[PDB]
């Protein structure tokens, strides 16, 4: 499920009954943050709206927590993947209201 | 105040008219593609103008033409065609 939500999935056909294994970059431990696809999307959005260059998830989330309200709303306007594992969990009302 | 209201009303009308003009050629998300010219012709249009000019060049006299080319189942002078098409 967590592999399905990555751009590398576009190259794999799949099969609904016992979906076949997908070899994701995250599987290889030598991979740095810059090569992660989700971090790629997050860094692109943060640079575009938060106006902050970010090289790790720690920095990304620190920037998100420090962000001013207008930038927070702008970033969440263009952010689409709130949940990757697709487990029903409560979310901040930014996705509501 | 009347001038501001008239200008803003005209601006809103123009925005709505452009919105409708784009909506007419939706085709379920794909905007209308221009007509495709014949083989080898290339059309150029000055923006904001009322004409377009389309050029073609035959390196050989006429043997480069499609009709003489098909034939399916001296180095004469090369030819240059320029067609000017206005909006009339």
């Amino acid at each position: 499920r967590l592999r399905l939500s990555r751009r590398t999935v576009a190259n794999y056909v799949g099969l609904i009954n016992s979906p076949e294994v997908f070899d994701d970059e995250s599987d290889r431990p030598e991979t740095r943050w810059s090569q992660d696809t989700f971090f790629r999307e997050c860094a692109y959005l943060s640079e575009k709206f938060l106006k902050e260059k970010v090289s790790n998830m720690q920095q990304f989330e620190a920037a998100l927590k420090r962000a001013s309200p207008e930038a927070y709303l702008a970033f969440f306007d263009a952010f689409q993947q709130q949940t990757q594992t697709q487990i029903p969990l409560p979310s901040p009302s930014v996705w509501h209201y | 105040v009347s001038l501001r209201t008239i200008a803003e009303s005209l601006g809103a009308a123009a925005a709505a008219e452009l919105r409708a003009e784009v909506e007419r050629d939706t085709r379920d998300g794909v905007a209308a593609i221009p007509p495709l010219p014949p083989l080898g012709w290339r059309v150029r249009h000055p923006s904001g103008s009322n004409y377009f000019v389309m050029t073609r060049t035959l390196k050989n006299g006429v043997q480069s033409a499609e009709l003489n080319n098909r034939r399916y189942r001296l180095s004469r002078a090369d030819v240059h065609l320029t067609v000017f098409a206005p909006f009339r």
Partner: protein, 104 residues
């Protein structure tokens, strides 16, 4: 129940008593249940009551020209004949025109 055997004046009053948008659409869909000859008599009765026979009612009927127009349209119909992507396109085109300088 016999939808087309109801008293035409009663059905007409109940229809004129319609102003809410949601119940207005409910009536819009409900009018097709009546017979093709019942709808014409409904239109005739409503027109007559709004016009000449307004006095045959104990209490004067109130004005609902929206109901009158819609009922007339429905009767004529039943009787014989006798987007984000678009906004993106628009903003892209405006940006281009800015590039061409047609919009200084």
């Amino acid at each position: 129940a016999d939808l087309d055997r109801v008293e035409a004046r009663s059905v007409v009053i109940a229809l004129n008593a319609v102003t809410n948008a949601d119940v207005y659409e409910f009536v819009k869909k409900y009018l097709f249940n009546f017979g093709e000859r019942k709808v014409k008599f409904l239109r005739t009765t409503y027109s007559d009551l709004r016009g000449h026979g307004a006095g045959k009612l104990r209490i004067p009927l109130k004005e609902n020209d929206n109901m009158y127009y819609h009922v007339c349209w429905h009767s004529s119909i039943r009787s014989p004949r006798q987007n984000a992507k678009i906004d993106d396109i628009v903003k892209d085109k405006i940006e281009k025109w800015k590039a061409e300088g047609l919009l200084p």
